[model samples]
Target: TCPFYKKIPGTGFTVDAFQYGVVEGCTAYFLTHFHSDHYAGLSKHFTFPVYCSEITGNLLKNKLHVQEQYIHPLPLDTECIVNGVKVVLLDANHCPGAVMILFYLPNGTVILHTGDFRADPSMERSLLADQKVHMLYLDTTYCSPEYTFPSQQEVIRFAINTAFEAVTLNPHALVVCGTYSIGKEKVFLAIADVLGSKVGMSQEKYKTLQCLNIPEINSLITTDMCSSLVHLLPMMQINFKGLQSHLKKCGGKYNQILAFRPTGWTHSNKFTRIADVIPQTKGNISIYGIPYSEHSSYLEMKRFVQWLKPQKIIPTVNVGTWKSRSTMEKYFREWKLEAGY
Candidate 1:
């Protein structure tokens, strides 16, 4: 569904920034993360003050070249008043700077927008306090019950161990990890820490991490060449066989290539769609699709909703056709019914 922005009906405050999703005359904005899709239309041309985490602010300045005057950085778990509405930001648990926004209306109604996050159990006790939610804008990326996968922590361990094992299997092997321009820096940094190695990245990726000021990645990087057998390739890399070229770019030093793609698509032990399930191998190149994503699975969505118990549930996607509030209530109630007992 991936609907971009949400508005506070009475106060006229907005959450999120998108080229197409930006409201016609918004004076202030909210940015959840540094992903390009979230800021589709943002640029130096942007004029409104944006409320977001400091890491996102850094990305806008260093990458999008947004002026500091346009950015209004805020710390997590703090309350602030903007546009006559009281708001608080909570750590979204998806990435370093990702946040979940909470709006407290003057009439005591509260609205929560979870911007691309993995829900945390600890947040339940803190969030479900004296103030209950009137509406919940959910991140239902893995909304289908079929999307059952292991935890990110477990998958990270798998990625690290498997990548290390792949290196051990082939004496002349290099681990090519598919990463994103902004998110998932944890996976590669953890891999490097455990393997006693570093994953070289393009200047663009390096600049992003450097600007984010992640001590973990900064310590592992080198400038002379694309150093390390483990390479932090882009997360969008498909056609697993294509990685061989990247490996070969190492001046024929390595004889084998193994690329790890961490995504939710790899759930259910089914890898036939993207590539062969049995570690698609062509000569010295191999690709593995590990189940790693920063989204709530169907079960997770159910649990989060049950805890929040919102009167209305607004989905982030644009696929639904609920004609009225009654229809939406019935739909979400049925979702609770179908998602689990």
Candidate 2:
């Protein structure tokens, strides 16, 4: 899910542009996270020098089996010289191993490339407090006013309580929560805690979590299908038809299925109550669409842009056409003007 503008001019670096397969004149490949979209072009047969955070390096090796000789794991918040350019890795609040790369060019240009991040106030207090950033390559996933949604905590709280109440009543229901391979751990983690049950997943997911190296998360997941009523599956399987086939394949172990599909597209300010974001019910299966977003809301992006006020802003996502890029530029310019930048 990257656009054509992956190359950073005047530097031999490319961020998450693996789909093009070894960009010409590029000396370094920087990966922001282990998500399939960003690391789409990587494979076992590849041999390229890749740089990323320590955790992301571990995931690349463990998941894709890229050779150890080609992997470079950079320390967070520390400066490293790569081909005569200073680079630093700052935490991206999107996923466990995600990071935003900061580049200090030889010509005194400060550029920050945020590879998928949720805007937060803590960023202003950290590494960027005193620096004057010239270019900002932003993650414009939720750049429009129409894409606003509730906070992560609010949706998690609502989703856990909703699932808890349903399972408490059904007593023999299977609670399935949708998730990506690397992101959205908190949603299922809280559900497991409140229900006091282990999370069941495929062996593939278990191995990926093992690479993350969190004992608390490792303790909560198991490969035994019948051991836990709470199951974790890929995000696309939470629908009614998918859940019905999965429940039917279970050989009648659960009387009903309570599924949760937590995403940003499901809710907005127009939704009055947390519960107002409705659910779909068909026979013994029910799917609740919660407004749990990993990306920043429109208001959050505004606050971040106002705080940074970079001289130049670049839209990473939704940049396929001139119309989409121009629309986001309007918001950026308006925020910068409001901040008196």
Candidate 3:
């Protein structure tokens, strides 16, 4: 009573029941990362035993704060068996705890699911040493040629340069940049590590990084307590000049009101008010635009797929959704295939 593509009763296939349903007897589930989209359905629908990396597991338990009963944490590159399926977690360079899942079935079928990954040479090296993959589930988020990103070092440099520039122009300004609290902490520390010796963070910035558990930064800053200077004020609190004036009257140091909002591409373009507020500070306020991303670029995607040479490739992230189905089809059609299939 095994189910194929067509809906069947005893085999546990029903389109109307859920968006996508695995066979009822499915024994194991592997989560590639802790990103909201990837694991959102798990708590409700996926009641089976789950496997993920230790860091990813910690993030799920501590950050997103999910229940612990279902998650099984395993170290990266370690092979473990869950319900008779051999699963291995490999480092996915997209974030702090991200991983690519390799599921090896007993019948000699190996599926490598590359959950949102960047084209990092280290990741490739790890993959090569860990397993000989049969099928690859790629992250073709930007498989098209138009999407290109600079190197990771370049992106980090841009962020550091912008932060330094902001501090240099306004010594007293509170600098705020928006980023993933966990993922981008490194970027902030890198900036602090290099620039902390030069323009040095106030006691406020130091405390903030410390509270955020960003280590090796105290040596670069003047004061360890500078990180706590900026409070999480609502957008509307500084959305208009009236509120700004009110804050100014309330003994707020208008000169020390540097805010860095590190946001995704979707919200970066919409921060027009930040630009407007900068002018009001008489050149004291600096809004630094640093384009830091967690996902892979088109070139990375292509190069990774070329190096892996998996027999069959399936995309699992955004590019694999129904809306981008044709784009996915075109990618596999165009990419060169390895011999001996």
Candidate 3 on 75-169: residue-level lDDT in tens? 88777766555667777777666777666767676667667677676666674655677777677776666565455576576666655666677
Better of 1 and 3 by lDDT: 1
Residue 226 in candidate 3, Cα distance off native in Å: 5.9
Quickly count the clashes in candidate 1: 6
lDDT (C-alpha, whole model) for all candidates: 0.72, 0.85, 0.54
In the range 1-341, model 1's lDDT, one tens digit per residue, is: 22333666666556764565457656677888887767778888887788899888998898999998989998777778888888888878787678898989888889898988887677786655658799888786766667666677777777677767777777688777787656676677777666777667778877877777576555686443545766776666545546756765788778887777766645444333322234667887777777677777767877778777787777775335554434445657786676552
Residue 20, model 1, lDDT: 54
Superposed model 3: Cα runs more than 4 Å off: 1-23, 42-48, 63-67, 127-131, 180-182, 195-284, 319-323, 337-341
Model 2: weakest 10-residue lDDT segment is: 263-272
TM-scores of all predicted structures? 0.87, 0.94, 0.70
Identify the leading candidate in terms of lDDT. 2
Please say which candidate is ahead in lDDT: 1 or 2: 2
- Residue 290, model 1, lDDT: 71
The lowest-lDDT stretch of 10 consecutive residues in candidate 1 is 269-278
The lDDT of model 1 is 0.72
**What is the TM-score of candidate 1?**
0.87
Best first by lDDT, ranked: 2, 1, 3
Per-residue lDDT for 291 in model 2? Answer: 73
